């Protein structure tokens, strides 16, 4: 055939892939974390947006740290052979490198490790996208008038 | 072989070390902007370029309002972290 460049990911697999949305709004009283008002608006917007991009959207609400890890482990163990990519959206409280389950924090590294090139072979060479809506600390940007 | 950390893209809503803003009625600044740009450009632009538009939208169109002076009139810039090895288009 003609010249082949391979500059863009192959996105014509039978399926675009999964879009896992973890929407944590209500947290256990014991954690002292506030309810994240408005997150359902985000969850619905994401569901529709990725639906139109042809992703298999799965919305999960108020997951404990244990459920988050279990979900990610299970998802990484699925056969993604016929899928072009993987998308995971995290909506919750957070700090640098951490995302909160309803009962406590989870290291982002723990979640992403399940999808490493050597741990999820059906996604090796395919784009793995993690969209994170959560704090990464307590600094405030004062901005500058342009 | 390829790196086990290759082909990952982290679209952070805010810069390292910073708070991230969310409006209780309209949703988070970042997600609002991300969905708007994907709906408008997913069938036209490469993903990094879409995210750059998201950065500009969040950076220019949003500013916090708070009765607490400490949290008033603040800004936000999303943070694109790419370990991707190819361009990514949602269409083909």
């Amino acid at each position: 055939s003609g010249i082949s460049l391979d500059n863009s990911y192959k996105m014509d697999y039978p399926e675009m892939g999964l879009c896992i949305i973890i929407n944590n709004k209500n947290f256990h009283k014991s954690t002292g974390m506030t309810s994240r008002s408005g997150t359902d608006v985000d969850a619905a917007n994401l569901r529709e947006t990725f639906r139109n991009l042809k992703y298999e959207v799965r919305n999960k609400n108020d997951l404990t740290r244990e459920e988050i890890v279990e979900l990610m482990r299970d998802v990484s163990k699925e056969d993604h052979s016929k899928r072009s990519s993987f998308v995971c959206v995290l909506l919750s409280h957070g700090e640098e490198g951490i995302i909160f389950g309803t009962n406590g924090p989870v290291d982002l590294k723990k979640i992403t490790n399940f999808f490493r090139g050597d741990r999820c072979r059906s996604l090796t060479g395919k784009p793995k996208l993690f969209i994170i809506q959560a704090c990464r600390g307590t600094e405030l940007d004062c901005g500058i008038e342009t | 072989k390829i790196p086990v950390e290759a082909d990952f893209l982290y679209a952070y809503s805010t810069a390292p070390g910073y708070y991230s803003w969310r409006n209780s009625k309209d949703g988070s600044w970042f997600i609002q902007s991300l969905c708007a740009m994907l709906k408008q450009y997913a069938d036209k632009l490469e993903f990094m370029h879409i995210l750059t538009r998201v950065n500009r939208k969040v950076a220019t169109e949003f500013e916090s309002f708070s009765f607490d002076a400490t949290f008033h009139a603040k800004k936000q810039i999303p943070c694109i972290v790419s370990m991707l090895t190819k361009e990514l288009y949602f269409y083909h």
Partner: peptide, 4 residues
Amino acid sequence: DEVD
């Protein structure tokens, strides 16, 4: 506006 609130923070996460």
